[PDB]
Design a protein around this ligand. Sequence first.
Ligand code: ZN
Ligand code: ZN
Ligand code: ZN
Length: 286
Amino acid sequence: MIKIGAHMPISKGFDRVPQDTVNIGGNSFQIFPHNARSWSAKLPSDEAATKFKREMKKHGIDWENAFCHSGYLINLASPKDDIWQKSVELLKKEVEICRKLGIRYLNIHPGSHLGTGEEEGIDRIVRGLNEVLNNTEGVVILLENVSQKGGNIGYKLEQLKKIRDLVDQRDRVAITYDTCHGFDSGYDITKKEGVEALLNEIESLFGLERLKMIHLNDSKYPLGAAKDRHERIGSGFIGEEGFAVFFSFKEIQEVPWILETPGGNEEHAEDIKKVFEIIEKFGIEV
Ligand SMILES: [Zn+2]
Ligand SMILES: [Zn+2]
Ligand SMILES: [Zn+2]
C-alpha cells in the first residue's frame, strides 16, 4: 500500500493535522514541532497533545507514518560553540515535543560547518547527537541527505554513515532520503540503474530498515546542479517518467512518501493525485 502525505501546517493546532492529511488524500505526514522564532520553544499543552492523539486514532493514521521535522536554526555542525549549545538544547526540546505528541521520528539536516571543515563538522554533529540521545528516550532521529551548498554536510550518503557509526545510540539514528537533494547531488532516480545503485548504497551503508521516510520532491534544476530548489511532482527535471521509475521499486514503496513541494494543502492534494496518476499511466504495480 502506498504511504503518502505531505509536510502539514500546524498553525491552527496539531490536532487539525490528521483531518487535513486525509482531506488531501494522504495517510502520512510531517510537521514542525513548533513555530518558535528563536532558541526556546514551548511544549504542546496536555490538552493539545491529547487532541492530536485522539484525531490520530480517529483517522487511523499509522504512527510509523507520522514525522516531525526540525526547524532551520539547529546546526549541530556549527563552529560557533554558543550556536552548537543552543542547537543541542533546542534539539532536546524538540525530542520532548515529539515524546509529548507520541511522534516517533524527528528529521534533521546534519548541519553546516560554514567552511571550517567537513571532518571536524561531522565530529561536532556526532557529539551533539550524543548529548541529545543520551539525555532523552524513545524518539529516533532521522538524518536527511542535503544539497552540496556552502558547508552542508550530508550531500553524500557516505557522510550520513560516518555520523551514524560514531554515535552512541545508533538504533535511535535512522535515515530520510530526499529525492530533490539526492538529484542535486548526482543520485539519478530517473534511471533504474540509478535507483538500484541508490538502494545498494543504502542497504550497504545503513541497511534498508534504516530508511524511514522519503521526501518526494521534484527539482527546479538538472541532475547534479546543487541548487536546493524543490518543484511540484512532474513539473521538474525528475519528471513524470523519472518518478515512475522510482515508484516501480518495491523497496521504495515500503517507505512513506512525504511531499515538500511548493504550495499549501491545496497544491499537495494535487501532487498526491499526480502521483496516483503517474502510477496509473505508467502501469506501476502496485
Ligand atoms: Zn529537510
Ligand atoms: Zn527534504
Ligand atoms: Zn530542500
